[PDB]
Amino acid sequence: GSFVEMVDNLRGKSGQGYYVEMTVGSPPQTLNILVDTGSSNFAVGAAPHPFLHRYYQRQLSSTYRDLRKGVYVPKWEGELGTDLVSIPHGPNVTVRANIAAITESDKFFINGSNWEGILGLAYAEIARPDDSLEPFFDSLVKQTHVPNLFSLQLCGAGFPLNQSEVLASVGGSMIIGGIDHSLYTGSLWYTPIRREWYYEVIIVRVEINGQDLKMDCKEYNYDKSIVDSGTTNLRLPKKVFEAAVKSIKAASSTEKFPDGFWLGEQLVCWQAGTTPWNIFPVISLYLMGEVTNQSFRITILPQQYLRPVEDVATSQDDCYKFAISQSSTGTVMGAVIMEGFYVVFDRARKRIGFAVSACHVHDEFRTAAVEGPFVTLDMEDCGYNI
Numbered sequence: 001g002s003f004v005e006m007v008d009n010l011r012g013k014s015g016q017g018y019y020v021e022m023t024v025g026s027p028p029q030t031l032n033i034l035v036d037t038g039s040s041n042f043a044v045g046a047a048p049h050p051f052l053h054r055y056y057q058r059q060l061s062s063t064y065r066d067l068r069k070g071v072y073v074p075k076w077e078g079e080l081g082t083d084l085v086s087i088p089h090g091p092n093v094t095v096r097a098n099i100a101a102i103t104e105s106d107k108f109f110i111n112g113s114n115w116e117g118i119l120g121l122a123y124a125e126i127a128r129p130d131d132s133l134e135p136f137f138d139s140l141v142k143q144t145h146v147p148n149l150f151s152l153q154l155c156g157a158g159f160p161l162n163q164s165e166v167l168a169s170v171g172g173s174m175i176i177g178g179i180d181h182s183l184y185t186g187s188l189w190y191t192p193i194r195r196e197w198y199y200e201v202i203i204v205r206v207e208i209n210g211q212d213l214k215m216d217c218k219e220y221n222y223d224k225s226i227v228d229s230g231t232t233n234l235r236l237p238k239k240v241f242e243a244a245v246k247s248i249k250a251a252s253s254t255e256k257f258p259d260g261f262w263l264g265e266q267l268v269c270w271q272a273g274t275t276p277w278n279i280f281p282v283i284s285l286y287l288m289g290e291v292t293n294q295s296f297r298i299t300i301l302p303q304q305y306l307r308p309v310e311d312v313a314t315s316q317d318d319c320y321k322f323a324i325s326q327s328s329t330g331t332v333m334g335a336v337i338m339e340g341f342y343v344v345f346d347r348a349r350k351r352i353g354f355a356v357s358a359c360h361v362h363d364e365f366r367t368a369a370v371e372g373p374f375v376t377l378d379m380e381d382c383g384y385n386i
């Protein structure tokens with residue numbers, strides 16, 4: 001591991017998000033910021049809010065610059081400006097970046113998440129108000145010698161973290177500008193970034209316990225497939241969700257679960273330590289490789305797709321919610337999927353790499369996997385075109 005200063009710089013969990021500490025302004029104002037690969041704005045609470053115990057105070061920053069422009073994101077509303085920004089446990093550089101000062105929000109801030117802002121790591125094409133508002137990471141690369149690449153190791157604990165535990169627990173690593181080899185095992189496999197807006201990829205095959213879901217592969221990427229640390233669940237296009245759940249139910253049929261469970265609404269609980277991991281199937285997603293007609297697969301365990309939640313009775317049972325849900329906006333590889341892997345966002349080579357995470361939760365019989373190569377034909381046809 002060559003980036004020790006950035007290792008273990010994240011805190012949080014799949015349900016409320018993973019955040020990194022940042023400073024804004026002069027003198028520096030410390031804030032916890034949500035790491036979000038599904039958006040492109042750097043936005044921070046800038047006014048009192050029931051869920052914020054701190055916020056950005058523009059009038060206290062000598063380096064604050066007002067852009068005299070508003071921003072609306074449906075929801076949070078803010079005022080645009082720029083100021084000096086740093087990441088304490090990151091590259092030792094300070095950059096001037098766009099900052100949306102959030103003055104009004106509805107259902108944005110999560111009570112107890114411990115984060116006061118969001119760091120949108122995706123491309124300018126999806127930045128608000130428009131693509132002229134340069135994203136933080138673009139500013140970082142243009143102003144310093146930091147390589148145009150970042151990598152994420154999101155670490156789920158595999159069990160419920162209480163309010164004090166989640167504050168004292170290491171939730172992972174965001175390595176800015178590099179790849180740290182201590183964060184993964186095995187090999188890194190790269191899939192093309194299809195287009196630079198969201199981190200868009202193409203899924204070419206889906207298996208549940210080795211059984212091909214057998215759908216037209218365009219179904220898997222309807223209308224797009226993205227990697228999004230700001231989303232908790234693995235989200236799947238309606239028809240793919242329906243087929244995947246049918247197959248997961250069939251594989252786990254030795255136990256009957258209520259419809260509320262499959263809807264991701266209700267928790268299921270087992271006596272402490274008796275969770276029947278083995279009756280649940282592994283899920284494999286085949287991703288387009290960098291070599292023509294070649295793919296690789298990432299395989300996740302139920303330890304990833306069943307999200308630990310504290311029993312409504314705080315009892316000693318191990319409880320979980322089904323963390324796979326339907327989408328009307330395409331496939332979303334959210335935090336529960338990212339928890340199984342070390343994910344490399346190689347902006348410079350327009351590719352995303354996957355490797356088994358050194359912190360993924362597993363059991364003595366099965367482990368998450370990243371394997372390849374596999375011969376796969378017509379993968380360009382798996383992409384969706386409006």
Ligand SMILES: CCCCNC(=O)NCc1ccc(CN2C(=N)N[C@](C)(CC(C)C)C2=O)cc1
Binds near residue numbers: 016108229230232
């Ligand atoms: C931080 C986790 C919140 C709870 N877990 C979810 O799964 N909640 C649903 C959900 C649906 C879609 C998105 C996509 N998404 C983002 N990735 N970023 C924004 C622009 C803002 C987000 C971060 C609030 C957004 O709407 C994000 C979250």
